[model samples]
Target: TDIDECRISPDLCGRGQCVNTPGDFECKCDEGYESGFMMMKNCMDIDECQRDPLLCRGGVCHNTEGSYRCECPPGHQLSPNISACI
Candidate 1:
């Protein structure tokens, strides 16, 4: 008999979603979460701060629980590019 592992243990999914399959289960990451090397067991937080080319050019990227934000220096402001500060 196939068992729903997620149903048996809520903590199995952590902050992600649990999908029951025919013979097993699938763990899918929620928004802002990602499946890393650990597969289902490793739902890692998406690090927007480490994005390629930078998500906040000329500024600092702050990674939050389920999202990210950009902050500029005292004398700078968000540029039209959105990803940069001017």
Candidate 2:
């Protein structure tokens, strides 16, 4: 017999989402999130600034939940993308 765990256990994987298989399932984390323990349940936010040093040239990189923000320095304003300053 086969059971659709995804259909029955909606939100079981949080934002990672659930992929049902034969008598089993896997969690595939969505963008901006990292797989929890080899693609297990749940998703964790990735530190974008921690990996990219040049993400915000001349700006301060701040980490957020499932995302990040680039902050401008004094007398400077962030651009439309928040990744640049002027």
Candidate 3:
């Protein structure tokens, strides 16, 4: 069955963007941002500034398919979640 963002929650991922795709749905990061989880409720930030070269450069790092951004810029930070930051 296809996944429905609306059905699961009214405002899915508060700060993140929820995308509905075939067979599944995903939570994506906005511009200048990154997330590190495929499933909902556990998405973490990908610190690009700390990492070399930085991930999600040039093109926006959206959480789709089954992967996430390797790094996130300095100014950006992870969205709200129960998980602790590394």
Candidate 4:
């Protein structure tokens, strides 16, 4: 029998792509997302802050829904590299 993974459970793959195969299926995480350790049921946002601390040097890293942003203290401006603050 053929199984429609996408239609079987709408919420099974949150913010991810649902691929249906022969009698089975697969879940692919979208950009800025990663597969959770638990299972393919849901995809987690990729923590850019933790992934690369250097992404925001001399600045604070804040994680968002699907991405991250750098915050520099007063009197400091982000450099052209978009990583360090000068």
Candidate 5:
């Protein structure tokens, strides 16, 4: 009835799904991304590796936007899709 603007694109709300209100909506950021999706108009990447220094086990933690990456030590070769050391 009100043009049904609730089913709008999820892109508008960033990493979270749209919900509540029809004419309007709510934004809920995904886990670890935090709640900076509104003002910044996108998801915010948190420093996960910084928080968990013991992470990655036999690999090094790399900080990246939207997510973190695990990288093995030099000389130690791991699968292209893999990051941790075998």
Candidate 6:
């Protein structure tokens, strides 16, 4: 069965567009805002600009999967304790 993303309420991500993926739906945010989630709403956006961009160290914040990742910088090591970027 196909999930009607339009029916997903409270708005997805508070901004951007919601797309139906293979087995689930995803919310893609605009520039600056990263991907996040609310209690009963679709994927939401993280205000990257609201906090320190380096909060995650050298990793670049990219929106993907069902959440976010703190992309490790080149030649750097990723600690198991560190997986998210604020």
Error of 6 at 82 (Å): 24
RMSD of 3: 11.5
lDDT of 6 by residue, 1-86 (tens): 66776457536755666767666776666653454555633444454423444545556655434334455653565432345333
**Least accurate stretch of 10 residues (summed lDDT) in model 2?**
74-83
User: lDDT score, residue 31, model 1?
Assistant: 72
For model 5, what is the error of residue 56's alpha carbon versus the real structure, in angstroms, after optimal superposition? 4.2
Tell me the tens digit of each residue's lDDT in model 3 across 25-86: 66665442444445553235544433333335433344333234422333455322211122
lDDT of 6: 0.52
- Window of ten residues with lowest summed lDDT in model 3: 77-86
TM-score of each: 0.54, 0.53, 0.39, 0.57, 0.41, 0.39
User: What's the best-to-worst order under TM-score?
Assistant: 4, 1, 2, 5, 3, 6
Give the Å error, residue 32, model 3: 4.8
lDDT of 2 by residue, 1-86 (tens): 56776676666566878788887767776767765555546677677776565666778777776787777754677643445666
What are the lDDT scores of the predictions, listed in order?
A: 0.65, 0.67, 0.46, 0.68, 0.57, 0.52
- Pairs of residues clashing in candidate 5: none
| Candidate with more favorable, higher lDDT: 1 or 3 | 1
The alpha-carbon RMSD values of the candidates against the true structure, listed in the order shown, are 4.2, 4.2, 11.5, 4.0, 5.9, 10.0
Model 4, 44-80: lDDT tens digits are 7777767775766678776676677777754678543
lDDT, candidate 4, residue 16?
Answer: 80
Please name the candidate that would achieve the greatest TM-score relative to the true structure: 4
| Clashes per model (N, Cα, C within 3 A) | 0, 0, 3, 0, 0, 2
